[PDB]
Each structure stands twice: as C-alpha cells, then as structure tokens.
Design a protein around this ligand. Structure first.
Ligand code: BLA
Ligand code: BLA
Ligand code: BLA
Ligand code: BLA
Ligand code: NAG
Ligand code: NAG
Ligand code: NAG
Ligand code: NAG
Lengths: 166, 166, 166, 166
C-alpha cells in the first residue's frame, strides 16, 4: 500500500496478545496512506470465529454518501506469535497485520509490511474503541511509529465526526 | 504426513471449484498413513465462514470409544485457485489442502503435500457423502493417486461401520 | 515496484525456457517505473553459476556519469517451471522474475509481480541484445504487456544512446 | 527429513554470522537421520558465489565405494539474518539451513526445520574442519540440541575413518 525505501522493519508486537479481548469495534483515528480506504468514518468489526482466529468486517462512508464494506478472516499462523496475524479479505491476496501495542479497552497500534526488493510497502494505523482517542495516547503511539521509520508527518487523520458519519 | 522420495508432485485440482457445494459432512473412506488420525469413523464437517473460506470440524472415534475432534479454518489464499486451500488447524502449523476432484454430492479426492528437499511428505484421502463409496468410484480415484506417484497399496481403509461408529 | 489495482495477473511464460540461451548481455529498452533504476544505459548481464540457476550483474549510468551496479543470483525454485525465477540481489529481499517471451537472440519481455492485498506491485521490461530494438518487435511486446493491464503510456523509455551512455 | 511431534522450534542462530569465514571444507561428524545421506565420509564444501551467498558442493562415499555428490546454492534471503540460510540443491525444493553456532576454525552446529501440521521434520548436524572433533566440543553442541528437543540417542555418528574414506 505505501512504498518507502529500505526493507520492511521488524518492530515489537504486543506481548502476550489476547485476541478475545481484541474483538469488537475499533475506530480508525490516523493511518498511513493506502489503496483500500477511499473515504472516512472507517471502522473494523472483529468477531468470534467458529474455527481458528476471527472474522473481520471493515466499513466506511464514501464522500458521495455510499457506504462500503468488506469481510475477511484473521489468523495467527504461529500460535506462539499471537500478535502477528494475517488477514484474508474477500477478493484480496493475504496481508500481514501485526498488533504493535494495544490495551484492549482504548487504543491499538497496527502495523503491516510487505517486501519489495530494496524497498517496502507499509501500512500503519492508530485505532480506538471510540470515535476519538485522547491527544496523549495518539502522541505516544506516533512516538513508537517513528522508531521503525513511519513519518508522523505522512499520516492521514480519519474523519470520525458523529453527524457526518451517521 | 507421509515421507516419499522426490519433490511434491503438482497434481491437477478440480476445475472451477465451488466451496459452497463442498460444505457439509464428508466421511473418510481411504487415506494415506498420517500422524493425526488416531482411530476410525473420521468425518470432516465444513461450514460457512462469515469471513472468507469455510470453518472446519474434523472428528474421529478412538479404540476406547473416546471421541476426538479439532476445529480449524480453511482459506483459498488465491481466489483464482479456489480448489487450492490452506487449512489452519488449532495447535497446528498451516497445511496445504487440494481438492483434486469432486462431484460434490458423492465423492472427493483430497491431496496435501509439503516439500522436504528431494523428499516430500504427502497426505491423500478419499471421502464420501456416505459412510461408504462404491468400489468403482474408489478404484477410479485410486487411479488418479497412482498417476501422480502415490502407492495404492499403502492406503489405509477407514472403519465406517454403523455398529462400531454409533 | 509500481502499484496498480487488482491482484497480480498470471500471464503466460516462455515455453521450454532455456536459461543457457538467455545468458549474456541485455539492454533495457523500456520498463515500468520503479525504485531501483535511477538513470539510463541500464544493462543486465547473466552468467554461469557453480550451483543452481545463474548469476546477475545489473548496471546503469547516473546523470552525473557515475556508474551504479548490483550483483545477484537467479534461481528457478521449481525446475518444471524454468521461466518462473526468483532474483536475489545484494541488500534486497527476493523478487519474482518471469521470462514471458524471448527468442534469446533478440528480445525478451520480463515480468515481476508482488501482491498487496487488492492491489499489486508490478515491474515489466522490454530488453534486447542490442541497445535498440525494432519498432515492430516493441509493439508486439506492448500488445502482451497491455493484456495484463500495463498501459504503454505508463512506460518509460530507457536511454541507450551510444554517446551518452559511453 | 526426520519427523518429530510438535511445531518446529525457533533456536538462536550464530550471532554476527560471517558467511565468508564459513567457506571451505567441513566434515560430517554427527547428524540426525535423514533421507539424503546414503553412505559415509560426507563432506560439504562451500565456495564463493559470483552472485549472492555462496556455492554448495556436498559429497559422500557409498558403501560400495562409489562416490556421490550434489551441487547447490546457499542464500540468506534476509540479509539482516545471515545465519538463516536457504539451500537450493539441484532438483530439490528449497530447504532451511541455520548455523546455530560456529567458531569458524573448528566446529559448527547446523539446524534445519520444516513444519508438518502438528508435527515437523528436522535435520541437525555437527560438522568439523577435520574428520574428527574433540569429545568436549561434541558434547557441548549436543547440549544445545537437547534444549530444543533433538535426542542425542537419535543421532548417527558418521564414518570418517581415514583408511575407509581413502
Ligand atoms: C517489485 C519487483 C522488483 C524487481 C523485479 C526488482 C529488481 C531489482 N533491480 C535492482 C537493481 C537494478 N536493476 C537494474 C535493471 C534491470 N533489472 C531487471 O530485472 C532488468 C531486466 C534490468 C535491465 C537491465 C539496474 C540497472 C539496477 C541497478 C541500478 C542502480 O542501483 O543504480 C535491484 C536491487 C535493489 C536496488 O538497487 O534498489 C532489484 C531488487 N526490484 C523490485 O522491487
Ligand atoms: C499493505 C497492506 C495492506 C493491508 C493491511 C490491507 C488491508 C485491507 N483493507 C481492506 C478494506 C478496508 N479496510 C478498512 C479499514 C481498516 N483496514 C484495516 O486493516 C484497519 C485496521 C482498518 C481500520 C478500521 C475499510 C473501511 C475497508 C473497506 C474499504 C472499502 O470497501 O472501500 C482490504 C480489502 C481490499 C479492497 O476492498 O480494496 C484490504 C486488503 N490492504 C493492504 O494492501
Ligand atoms: C528437511 C531439511 C533438509 C535439508 C537441510 C536437506 C539437505 C540436503 N542434502 C542433500 C545432499 C547431501 N548432503 C550431504 C551432506 C551435508 N548436507 C548438509 O546440510 C550438511 C551440513 C552436510 C555435511 C557434509 C551430502 C553428502 C549430500 C549428497 C548425497 C549423495 O549424493 O549421495 C540434499 C539433496 C537431495 C538429494 O539429492 O538427496 C538436500 C536437500 N534436505 C532436507 O530435506
Ligand atoms: C502434511 C499434511 C498434513 C495434513 C493435511 C494435516 C491435517 C490435520 N488433521 C488434523 C486433525 C484431524 N483430521 C481429521 C480427518 C481429516 N482430515 C482431513 O484433511 C480430511 C479430509 C479428513 C477426513 C475426514 C480428523 C478426524 C482429525 C482430528 C483427529 C484427532 O483429534 O486426533 C490436524 C490437527 C493437528 C494434528 O492432530 O496433527 C491436522 C494438522 N496434518 C498434516 O501434517
Ligand atoms: C460513489 O462512488 C461509487 C464508486 O465510484 C459509485 O459506485 C456510487 O454509485 C457513487 N455514489 C453515488 C453517485 O451516489
Ligand atoms: C482413551 O485414550 C486416550 C489415549 O489413547 C486417553 O487419553 C483417554 O483418557 C482414554 N479414555 C478412556 C480410557 O476411555
Ligand atoms: C551522482 O548523483 C547521485 C545522486 O544522489 C549521488 O549519489 C552521487 O554522489 C553523484 N556522483 C557524483 C557527485 O559524481
Ligand atoms: C553402488 O550402488 C549404487 C546403489 O546402491 C549404484 O547406483 C551404483 O552404481 C553402484 N556402484 C557400482 C558401479 O557398483
């Protein structure tokens, strides 16, 4: 999704990550530019799976008012690295999805990277259990992002205004 | 997981494979020796996924009457190759799973292979919608297995006796 | 390293591809935009490998006259699909490299693709044993490139002018 | 190519591994049972690659005195992990090859593991720059292997007798 030079960094993930506590609704707060989000008001809904991992339901509002959504399935392929997921969205090739940091109740810092020779395509995201996230939490997560080569300057803020998104 | 010489054959899969028709209950009729089937009366149940692919519930009876079962998730990582799945069983590393041939309402030939240098570990299985499958059908699928270098003689026949399996 | 929408296409590869005839010097005639070519006069030289596959030496001229180069190794990881190689350059992650069409003594259409969810990163190339290639030959390879969704308008022409590259 | 239960362990590899100091001739001293060594007197010879990584030439003596050898190519696909190699032996699928420990001048502990569902296939070997290695060094390396579940009882000692190998 977003090309930067160098090979993919390998940042720390959430230690002892617990997926059952990660389920539910997360709101997109900030994110690296990508090719899949085409609007605003983005939310992810993660739910229990009857097999392994969990189901994914992403949803956003387009500027012309059209609502768009996708379904996918998330799986930790190595049970010993539960924070290192892979998402299989409908009609999409698999993408990595690592949870760098989360407190389950408020925020989460998500990272994703795929190698491209001497370059890489990266995606990063700050999400929240609410349409807003406190300013301090955001600055902290931006802080870790800098350590693995994401520029805070390059981030897009997602519109989560209550009126516009209903 | 059966070690044989040579690299994994790359047999053909079922053309224009339709997972919705592959769902439901399958009985293990014959199978390559493996490390996971520990008894008899083996069935697989495939169900809808709210994400992609489908949910898996494999189940067998032990000699002492104890029922053993596992849950997992099946996903075709390349949507243009829907018959070439990957199974993510709980407590297992991901494994390949090809539907080489199926008519959906009667039989299916499942193959799975993993390379080990100049050797490979293979798993193959004939399943049926009924606890039995006609011998001529069994013979035909055995033909297919031989055509890509599996020995029919090494196949194990699975117990599906209504008396024993009830 | 060029983003286009959709998953990677799988165009046909060169039949009975013979790497021994593909060795030697190729001149870049035109190619998709990428992050590795920074100048002109780009050439690829393919050489004997004492193990498997063959050796790679890429070379171009910078605008200030500085020559830049990389070495790498090409390996056909599956001997039965010899046209589907993996290229391992110094300081780079592995990249696919398919020889889609070549007559060995004149031209070659090179392709490479890596998936990015519902998008993909592509690189495509028309190379030649001479610094120029006939207009009729280029158009044919353009017909093929068009067939998997690269537009001739998106292509860059490589400077192979004898004076300037000298 | 030796099947054990559980997923592949992830042992530490030699820190700051230098492939350049690893070149030349190593003798097989002890090894896990595998499918490729058919005799004795086995040596691996590693040499410069004109591309990336290094060149591979393995050879052993068969019981009937006939000598057999293979060539391949070794590559660290992740340059930041030079001890984590991939070996491409001729006509074989790629295999992992980790250097867990080496002092370059005397010994080396090589490990390799490929997952097979809830089981795995492993290969490990203690090599030496001489046909023999001191018992204390061997014991030390056997110690390391034990910590990740290879049985010292399962190890085979390789015949490197000077006369028999002459
Ligand atoms: C997404 C896929 C992808 C591919 C395929 C790819 C090829 C590739 N070409 C490279 C160097 C190079 N490659 C070329 C040119 C060629 N390269 C060719 O495959 C051919 C046919 C030519 C034509 C001669 C040149 C000239 C260099 C060196 C340029 C320089 O470093 O200044 C490198 C080394 C890394 C770098 O210098 O940044 C890679 C990885 N990179 C990718 O990200
Ligand atoms: C390079 C890596 C990479 C990733 C990680 C990735 C995720 C991804 N997000 C998607 C949809 C979506 N994704 C989101 C939003 C999110 N998505 C998230 O992973 C998170 C955390 C949010 C935050 C809420 C939304 C709203 C959609 C639906 C978009 C639409 O239909 O327009 C899709 C589906 C494909 C599509 O319809 O275009 C993919 C593959 N794609 C990639 O190429
Ligand atoms: C599951 C992982 C796995 C590994 C790692 C592996 C290594 C491996 N060793 C091979 C040959 C060989 N390998 C060796 C010896 C060695 N090989 C070594 O990795 C080392 C350290 C030595 C020590 C000297 C020899 C002597 C041969 C040649 C066998 C012959 O031709 O008789 C081959 C070629 C296949 C063949 O033709 O038989 C492979 C794939 N195979 C696997 O399945
Ligand atoms: C290298 C290849 C390879 C494959 C394919 C594989 C499948 C596989 N089958 C499993 C359980 C199982 N698998 C089955 C039966 C089936 N399974 C089928 O794919 C089909 C068609 C049936 C027939 C109905 C059953 C009944 C179980 C549960 C067994 C138990 O509880 O012990 C498991 C779970 C973990 C384990 O017990 O090892 C795996 C990984 N394992 C491998 O190593
Ligand atoms: C907005 O855009 C989408 C895709 O471009 C389109 O399908 C949809 O109909 C548009 N909504 C309108 C015009 O209401
Ligand atoms: C049946 O078998 C398994 C092991 O084979 C054992 O764990 C289980 O307790 C047994 N149950 C009995 C004795 O019914
Ligand atoms: C050529 O230009 C590149 C641009 O970065 C630079 O790396 C290099 O120093 C230049 N060579 C010179 C100054 O001769
Ligand atoms: C020795 O035995 C091997 C098989 O065991 C055989 O292939 C080889 O040719 C034999 N060597 C000779 C010439 O006796």
């Amino acid at each position: 999704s977003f090309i930067k030079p160098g090979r993919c960094p390998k940042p720390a993930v959430q230690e002892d990550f617990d997926a059952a506590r990660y389920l539910g609704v997360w709101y997109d707060i900030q994110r690296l530019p990508n090719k899949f989000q085409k609007g605003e008001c983005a939310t992810a809904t993660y739910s229990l799976s009857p097999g392994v991992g969990f189901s994914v339901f992403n949803r956003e509002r387009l500027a012309n008012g059209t609502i768009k959504s996708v379904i996918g399935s998330a799986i930790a392929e190595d049970p010993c690295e539960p924070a290192k997921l892979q998402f299989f969205h409908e009609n999409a090739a698999p993408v990595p999805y690592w949870v760098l940091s989360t407190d389950y109740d408020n925020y989460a810092l998500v990272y994703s990277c795929i190698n491209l020779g001497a370059s890489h395509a990266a995606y990063a995201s700050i999400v929240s259990r609410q349409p807003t996230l406190p300013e301090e939490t955001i600055k902290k997560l931006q802080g870790t992002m800098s350590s693995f080569g994401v520029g805070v300057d390059t981030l897009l803020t997602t519109n989560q205004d209550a009126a516009y998104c209903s």
